[PDB]
Amino acid sequence: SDPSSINGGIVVAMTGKDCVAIACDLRLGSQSLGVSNKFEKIFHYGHVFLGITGLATDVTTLNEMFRYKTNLYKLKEERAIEPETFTQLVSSSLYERRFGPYFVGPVVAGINSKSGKPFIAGFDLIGCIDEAKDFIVSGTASDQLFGMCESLYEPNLEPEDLFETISQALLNAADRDALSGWGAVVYIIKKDEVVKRYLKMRQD
């Protein structure tokens, strides 16, 4: 019935020293029924990364939409979009559907190519921006993620330390949520290299 918790799934993003990290589970379901263990919720447009939880049809639709818009942006601007700008685009795009919204919980993550500054942001389904320094959480285990992130997180973590923190935050949260899990992916993002790691976790 509740659109934001039909398909299930989670996204978490964290900042570190000269780096950001964004991670997600791989589950897609029809309520109790597990349907897919390969449904990735993190996408990227140039160097800007976008996680999207919520209703899976909208996750797909919005990815296709932001690919569309960032591609036209790049052709006209003659440069790749930045995280701060993209965040505003995501906010605008969601709010234009104010009285018929996409049932999603987007999460932006990336590093500004000019300043080198790590950036993360989160949104509600209607476009309200949450620009936190520390971390952003989203999905059906957002409460669990808030609890994990609040205790495990410390500022200025190195890329390889940050990986451990965000991974353990995701995994242990997803294990306390029926509609999340079935695999997980973690992106470690630096100014000019990005490492993508699939995590091993319990398959139920």
Partner 1 sequence: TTIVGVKFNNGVVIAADTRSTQGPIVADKNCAKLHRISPKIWCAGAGTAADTEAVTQLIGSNIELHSLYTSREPRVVSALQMLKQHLFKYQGHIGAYLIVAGVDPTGSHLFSIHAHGSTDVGYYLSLGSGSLAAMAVLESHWKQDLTKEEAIKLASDAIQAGIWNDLGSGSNVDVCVMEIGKDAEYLRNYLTPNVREEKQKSYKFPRGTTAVLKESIVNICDIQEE
Partner 2 sequence: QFNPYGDNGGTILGIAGEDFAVLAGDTRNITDYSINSRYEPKVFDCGDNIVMSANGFAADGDALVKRFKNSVKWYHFDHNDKKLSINSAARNIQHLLYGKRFFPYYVHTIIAGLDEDGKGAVYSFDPVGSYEREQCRAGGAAASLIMPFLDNQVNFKNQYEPGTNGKVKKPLKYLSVEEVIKLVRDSFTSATERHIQVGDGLEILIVTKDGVRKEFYELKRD
Partner 3 sequence: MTDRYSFSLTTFSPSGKLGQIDYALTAVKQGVTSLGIKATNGVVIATEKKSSSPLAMSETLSKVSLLTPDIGAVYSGMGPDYRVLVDKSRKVAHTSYKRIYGEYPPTKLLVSEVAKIMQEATQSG
User: Where along the sequence are the contacts to partner 3 (CB under 8 A)?
Assistant: 76-77, 85, 88-89, 91-92
**Residue 143: its H or E element:** helix 142-152
Cβ contacts of 138 within 8 Å, gap of 6 or more = 10, 11, 12, 51, 53, 105, 106, 107, 122, 145
Q: Choose the contact partner of 163 out of partner 3, partner 1, Mg ion, none; CB within 5 to 8 A by kind.
A: partner 1
* Two structure tokens written together for 23: 């991670």
* Two structure tokens written together for 167: 């991974």
Toward partner 1, which CB reaches closer, 30 or 72? 72
Give me the amino acid identity at 73.
Y
Shortest spacing between CB 135 and partner 3, in angstroms: 23
Q: Does 161 help bind partner 2 (rule: CB under 8 A)?
A: no
Shortest spacing between CB 95 and partner 3, in angstroms: 10
* Two structure tokens written together for 64: 């296709």
Q: Does 200 help bind partner 2 (rule: CB under 8 A)?
A: yes
Q: Does 203 help bind partner 2 (rule: CB under 8 A)?
A: no
Of 11, 19, 16, the closest CA to residue 110 belongs to 19
Binding mask 145-184 for Mg ion (x = CB under 5 A): ----------------------------------------
Question: How many residues of this chain interact with partner 2, rule: CB under 8 A?
Answer: 16
Which ranges of 39-117 would DSSP assign to H, the alpha helix? 56-77, 83-95
Pair 169, 183: CB distance under 8 Å: no
Of 116, 121, 133, 120, the closest CA to residue 191 belongs to 116
Pair 157, 165: CB distance under 8 Å: yes
Shortest spacing between CB 35 and Mg ion, in angstroms: 6
Q: Does 55 help bind partner 2 (rule: CB under 8 A)?
A: no
Residue from 70, 87, 140, 144 touching partner 2 (CB under 8 A): that is 144
Stretch of 56-64, 75-83, 118-126, 150-158 lying at the interface with partner 2 (CB under 8 A): 150-158
Q: Does 204 help bind Mg ion (rule: CB under 5 A)?
A: yes
